[PDB]
Amino acid sequence: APDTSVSNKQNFSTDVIYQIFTDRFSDGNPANNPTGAAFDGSCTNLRLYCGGDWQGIINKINDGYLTGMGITAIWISQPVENIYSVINYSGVNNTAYHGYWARDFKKTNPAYGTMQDFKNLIDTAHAHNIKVIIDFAPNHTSPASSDDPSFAENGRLYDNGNLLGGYTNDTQNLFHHYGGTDFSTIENGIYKNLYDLADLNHNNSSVDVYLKDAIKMWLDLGVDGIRVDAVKHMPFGWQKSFMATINNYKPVFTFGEWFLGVNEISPEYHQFANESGMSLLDLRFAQKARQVFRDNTDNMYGLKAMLEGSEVDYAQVNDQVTFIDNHDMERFHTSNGDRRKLEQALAFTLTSRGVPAIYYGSEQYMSGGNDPDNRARLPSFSTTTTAYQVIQKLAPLRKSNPAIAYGSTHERWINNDVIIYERKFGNNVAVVAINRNMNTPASITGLVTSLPRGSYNDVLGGILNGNTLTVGAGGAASNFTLAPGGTAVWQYTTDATTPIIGNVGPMMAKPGVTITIDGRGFGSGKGTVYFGTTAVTGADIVAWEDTQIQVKIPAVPGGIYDIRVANAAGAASNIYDNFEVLTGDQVTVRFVINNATTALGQNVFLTGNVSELGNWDPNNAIGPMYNQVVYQYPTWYYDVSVPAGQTIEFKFLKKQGSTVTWEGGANRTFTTPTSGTATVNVNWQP
Numbered sequence: 001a002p003d004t005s006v007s008n009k010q011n012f013s014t015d016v017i018y019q020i021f022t023d024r025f026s027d028g029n030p031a032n033n034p035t036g037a038a039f040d041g042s043c044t045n046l047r048l049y050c051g052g053d054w055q056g057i058i059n060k061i062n063d064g065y066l067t068g069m070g071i072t073a074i075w076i077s078q079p080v081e082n083i084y085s086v087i088n089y090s091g092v093n094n095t096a097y098h099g100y101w102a103r104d105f106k107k108t109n110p111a112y113g114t115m116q117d118f119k120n121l122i123d124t125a126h127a128h129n130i131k132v133i134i135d136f137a138p139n140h141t142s143p144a145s146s147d148d149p150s151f152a153e154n155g156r157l158y159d160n161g162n163l164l165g166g167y168t169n170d171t172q173n174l175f176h177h178y179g180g181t182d183f184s185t186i187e188n189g190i191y192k193n194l195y196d197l198a199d200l201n202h203n204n205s206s207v208d209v210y211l212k213d214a215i216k217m218w219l220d221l222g223v224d225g226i227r228v229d230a231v232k233h234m235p236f237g238w239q240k241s242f243m244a245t246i247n248n249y250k251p252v253f254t255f256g257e258w259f260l261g262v263n264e265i266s267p268e269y270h271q272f273a274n275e276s277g278m279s280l281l282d283l284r285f286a287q288k289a290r291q292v293f294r295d296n297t298d299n300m301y302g303l304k305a306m307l308e309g310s311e312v313d314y315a316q317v318n319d320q321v322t323f324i325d326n327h328d329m330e331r332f333h334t335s336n337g338d339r340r341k342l343e344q345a346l347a348f349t350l351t352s353r354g355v356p357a358i359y360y361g362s363e364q365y366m367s368g369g370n371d372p373d374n375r376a377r378l379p380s381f382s383t384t385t386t387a388y389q390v391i392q393k394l395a396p397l398r399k400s401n402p403a404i405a406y407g408s409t410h411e412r413w414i415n416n417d418v419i420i421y422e423r424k425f426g427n428n429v430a431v432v433a434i435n436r437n438m439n440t441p442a443s444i445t446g447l448v449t450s451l452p453r454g455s456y457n458d459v460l461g462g463i464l465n466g467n468t469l470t471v472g473a474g475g476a477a478s479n480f481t482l483a484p485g486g487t488a489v490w491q492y493t494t495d496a497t498t499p500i501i502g503n504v505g506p507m508m509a510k511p512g513v514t515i516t517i518d519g520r521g522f523g524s525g526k527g528t529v530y531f532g533t534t535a536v537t538g539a540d541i542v543a544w545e546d547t548q549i550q551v552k553i554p555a556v557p558g559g560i561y562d563i564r565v566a567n568a569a570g571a572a573s574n575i576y577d578n579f580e581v582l583t584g585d586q587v588t589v590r591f592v593i594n595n596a597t598t599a600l601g602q603n604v605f606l607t608g609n610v611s612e613l614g615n616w617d618p619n620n621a622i623g624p625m626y627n628q629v630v631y632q633y634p635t636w637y638y639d640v641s642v643p644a645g646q647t648i649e650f651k652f653l654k655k656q657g658s659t660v661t662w663e664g665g666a667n668r669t670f671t672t673p674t675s676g677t678a679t680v681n682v683n684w685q686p
C-alpha cells in the first residue's frame with residue numbers, strides 16, 4: 001500500500017488531524033442524549049452534555065463537511081464509558097462530556113454511541129480515507145473522595161461491567177493514596193492525585209494488565225492512533241512498557257502532551273519525547289506561533305529560531321503533533337482579533353513539519369477563553385469560510401507532496417514580520433511566504449529557492465493575497481511585493497530515483513515486529529533494509545514499493561540502531577537513527593534501595609546488563625531515582641521497564657556531577673515476570 005493510504009496506522013505526517021470534542025460537534029442521534037441535570041440542549045452551560053455523538057461525525061463525513069475540507073484523520077474524545085454523575089463544584093454543575101472521567105475502559109460512553117456505532121464510525125471514516133485517533137487517559141478514573149464515598153461514583157473502575165473497586169476502602173491498592181499534588185516536583189505530580197481524580201496505581205499487576213488488555217481491544221476495533229492523556233503524571237517506566245505493548249501487538253501512532261509553561265521548556269519534556277517511544281504535542285511550536293501570529297510578543301526571528309531548534313533537538317521532528325490552540329488554551333481567534341491572524345497561523349501549521357492538528361471550529365472562527373469557554377458547540381457548518389477554504393487547499397498537499405509531509409525546513413528570507421521557508425524532500429519542494437504585518441507590504445529581494453524554472457501559481461488561489469512566483473535558473477525568484485497579511489504556497493513534485501526515508505514507525509519494538517518505513521525512491525523491486533550493519537532481505541521484507549516498505553525487525557541485540565534502505569540496484573538512503581530494538585516484551589518493575597545517603601547534588605541511579613538498563617554505562621543509567629512520596633530518603637525508588645521473563649544483572653550507583661560511586665559487592669540478579677509488575681527491595685552494599 002502507499003505511504004498515504006488510510007491503511008498506514010504507523011505514521012501520520014501525510015495527514016491533517018481535526019480534533020473533535022465529540023459532544024460539541026454534532027448530535028446525529030438525539031435518542032442517545034443524557035437527560036435531566038446532565039443535559040443542556042442549548043449548550044449554554046458548557047460543563048454539561050450538549051448531545052454530540054459518533055453518528056454526528058459519520059453524517060459530517062458522509063455529506064462531505066470533513067472530506068470537503070481535506071481532513072484525513074479525526075482525533076475524538078476518549079471513547080470509553082464515563083461516570084454518569086453531575087458533580088456540583090461550588091454551585092456549578094459538571095458532567096463527563098469531555099470523556100476524561102473514565103469508569104470502564106472496555107465499554108463505550110453511550111452518549112457518544114454503541115459499539116456498533118463505533119464500528120460504523122471506523123468503517124465510514126476508513127471508506128472515506130480518514131484515520132481515527134482516540135484519547136485514552138490511563139492515569140485515573142474519576143473524581144473521588146475516599147473520606148466521602150457518596151461523592152460522585154467514588155473513583156470506581158469496572159472491567160466490561162465487572163466492578164474491580166473504588167477509592168474508598170481500596171484494600172487491593174488499585175489507586176494511590178498520597179494526597180493531592182501541589183505540582184512542586186515531577187515525583188509529586190506522578191504519585192499524588194491530580195485535583196480530586198482517583199489516581200490509578202500501575203504498580204498493581206491487575207491495573208497494569210487491565211489497561212494493556214483494554215488498549216489492545218480498541219486496536220482490534222480498528223483505531224489508527226492514540227493520544228495518551230497526562231503523560232507528565234504517570235511513571236515513565238510504566239509508560240515505556242505500555243508503549244511496548246501496543247507496538248509489539250498492533251503498532252499505531254501514539255503521542256502525549258508534556259505541558260510547558262510560557263517559554264519554560266523542560267529537558268525531561270524532550271527526554272521523554274525521545275525515550276518513551278511516543279511523540280509529543282509540540283508545545284514549543286504552538287507557543288511561538290501564538291507569540292508571533294497572535295499576541296505579537298515575539299517576531300519572526302523567534303519563529304525561525306524555534307523552527308531551527310526543533311530539527312536537531314527532537315529525534316523524530318516528523319512525528320511531533322503541531323497545533324495553534326487546543327482544549328487547554330484560550331482560542332487563537334479573539335473578539336477584537338483580525339481573522340487573517342488565524343488564517344496565517346493555519347497556513348503556517350499546515351505546511352510546517354510534523355503532524356498538524358486543527359481544533360474543531362477553527363474554520364468557523366470560534367473565539368473563547370480557557371476551559372470551558374474554548375469548548376462551545378461549533379456554531380455552523382458553513383463550507384464557504386476563508387479558513388475552510390485554506391484548509392481545503394493546503395491539507396491535500398500532505399498526501400501529494402512529500403516535501404510538506406517529510407521535508408527539512410530552511411528559512412530562505414526573513415525580517416521582523418516576514419518569513420519565507422522552504423520544505424524539501426528529494427526533488428519535491430514547497431515554499432511558503434508569510435507577511436504578518438497587516439499594514440506594510442514587504443519588498444522581497446534576493447529570494448533563492450530549490451524550485452525548477454517556471455511560473456508557480458499560488459496553491460491558495462490568491463485567497464490570502466498570495467501571488468505567482470516566477471522562478472528562473474538556479475531557483476532565483478524574480479522580486480515581488482508580499483501584500484500586507486500576504487500568504488502564498490508554491491510547490492513542485494517529481495519521482496525520486498534514490499531512496500529517502502521520511503519516517504519510520506513504530507520506533508521501539510522487539511525482533512519480528514513489522515515496521516513501516518515511508519519515503520520515496522525505494523523502487524518496485526525488493527531491496528535491502530539495514531539495522532546497523534545487519535541486512536534484511538527477501539521474505540523478511542513483507543512488502544516493498546516505492547513509497548513504503550514493511551519489514552520485520554531482525555533478531556539483533558537490544559539497543560539503539562540506525563536504519564538504512566538500499567533499493568534493488570544498491571543505492572542507499574539517508575540514515576534514520578534512534579531506532580530502539582527492545583530485548584523483548586516489557587514489564588515494569590519498581591526498584592527500591594534503602595540506606596543510600598547522599599551529599600548535596602548526589603543522586604542514586606540504576607544500571608544493568610540489558611539495553612533497557614543502559615548496558616552498564618553510568619551515563620545511560622536509569623534515574624535519578626525518587627525519594628519523597630512512596631518512600632522517603634534515605635530510601636530511593638523508581639519504576640523501570642525491563643525485558644519480561646529473564647534474569648537481568650544490575651547494580652546501583654550514586655552520581656554527583658562526573659563522580660560515579662558504585663555500590664560494592666557482587667552484581668545483583670533478578671528474574672523479571674512474564675506480565676504484571678514486580679518490586680525489588682534492596683539495601684546499599686558499601
Ligand SMILES: C[C@H]1O[C@H](O[C@H]2[C@H](O)[C@@H](O)[C@H](O)O[C@@H]2CO)[C@H](O)[C@@H](O)[C@@H]1N[C@H]1C=C(CO)[C@@H](O[C@H]2O[C@H](CO)[C@@H](O)[C@H](O)[C@H]2O)[C@H](O)[C@H]1O
Nearest residue numbers: 098100194195197229230231232257258259260327328371
Ligand atoms: C492535568 C493536566 O496537567 C498538565 O497541563 C495543564 C497545565 O498544568 C496548565 O497550566 C494548563 O493551563 O492547562 C493544562 C490542562 O489542565 C499536563 O501536562 C497536561 O497534559 C494534563 N492535561 C490533561 C489532564 C486532564 C485530565 O482530567 C484534563 O482535565 C480534565 O479534568 C478536569 C477535572 O476533572 C475537568 O474539569 C476539565 O474540564 C478536563 O479538561 C486536561 O484538559 C488535559 O489536557
Ligand SMILES: [Ca+2]
Nearest residue numbers: 029033051053
Ligand atoms: Ca446525541
Ligand SMILES: [Ca+2]
Nearest residue numbers: 190191199233
Ligand atoms: Ca499518577
